[PDB]
């Protein structure tokens, strides 16, 4: 791996991974000790990933301002009808096929409606470089407002927008969320990956070991929580209520 980016899990434990300075993206089956590089084409410092139930992958190609998908056994990936973008950093997909983008370069997250492909733009304000996207169940987008070092939210429909009690916040570069509400980032220029659990107000930093710079964040419904370890070019993981990391085996 050489500075990993983006990282995405399904209900299966498949784990999904930017190689942003290989310009690929990778792929590691539960159990499995080696991985797979999936067929994309003429990718350029890829930033997000997104998986569906169907094993569709959608990836951020921030080099070429585009955002691009494989079904799976594939081998013709899709250019997605996404107009404007600017180095997109983040990607986040819902069960009907509505994709969410985080178009970093212009401060700004563009939603695709299913099937119409009509482009809309989310009433955030204020956001400064955005990167990381997440979308929960109930429809609600989480952006880490990079350049703000804050992370806001927003309900489907909404014109509140609101910012997630984080404290402290440097460059935060992912989001990740599950079925509780519970909301994990990575702190990327603190080196740390912080937690607002469900109901609580006080943030929790996860007992990973020698992180640097990290860079996305993914969580399933066993409350697993992966994490692109961009600095040291490795991705590692922690089991719900863990203090001792996995690194996983890409290479």
């Known amino acids: ?19 942003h300075g290989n310009n690929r993206v990778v792929k590691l089956a539960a159990g ?10 003429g990718l350029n410092t890829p930033s997000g990933v997104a998986v569906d139930s169907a094993g ?6 921030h080099g070429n301002n ?31 096929g509505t994709v969410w983008v985080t178009d970093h370069g212009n401060n700004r997250v563009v939603k695709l409606a299913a099937g119409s492909n009509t482009q809309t733009v989310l009433p955030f304000t204020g956001l400064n470089t955005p990167s990381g996207v997440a979308v929960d169940s109930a429809g609600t987008v989480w952006v880490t407002d990079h350049g703000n070092n804050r992370v806001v ?19 935060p570069s992912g989001v990740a969320v599950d079925s509780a509400g519970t909301v994990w980032v990575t702190d990327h220029g603190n080196n740390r990956v912080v937690k607002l659990a469900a109901g609580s107000n006080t943030q929790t930093v996860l ?37 001792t990391q996995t690194v996983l085996p890409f290479t």
């Open 153 to 171: 939210k927003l309900a489907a429909g909404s014109n509140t927008q609101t910012v997630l009690p984080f404290t402290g916040l440097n460059t």
């Open 207 to 243: 007992p990973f070991t020698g992180l640097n710079t990290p860079s996305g964040v993914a969580v399933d419904s066993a409350g697993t929580v992966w994490v692109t370890d961009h600095g040291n070019n490795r991705v590692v993981k922690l089991a719900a209520g863990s203090n």
């Open 56 to 61: 569709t992958v959608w990836v951020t190609d």
């Open 66 to 96: 585009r955002v691009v998908k494989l079904a799976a056994g594939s081998n013709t990936q899709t250019v997605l009808p996404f107009t404007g973008l600017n180095t997109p950093s983040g990607v986040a997909v819902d069960s009907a």
């Open 1 to 19: 791996l050489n500075t990993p980016s983006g990282v995405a899990v399904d209900s299966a434990g498949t784990v999904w991974v930017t190689d």
């Open 32 to 41: 499995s000790n080696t991985q797979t590089v999936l067929p994309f084409t």
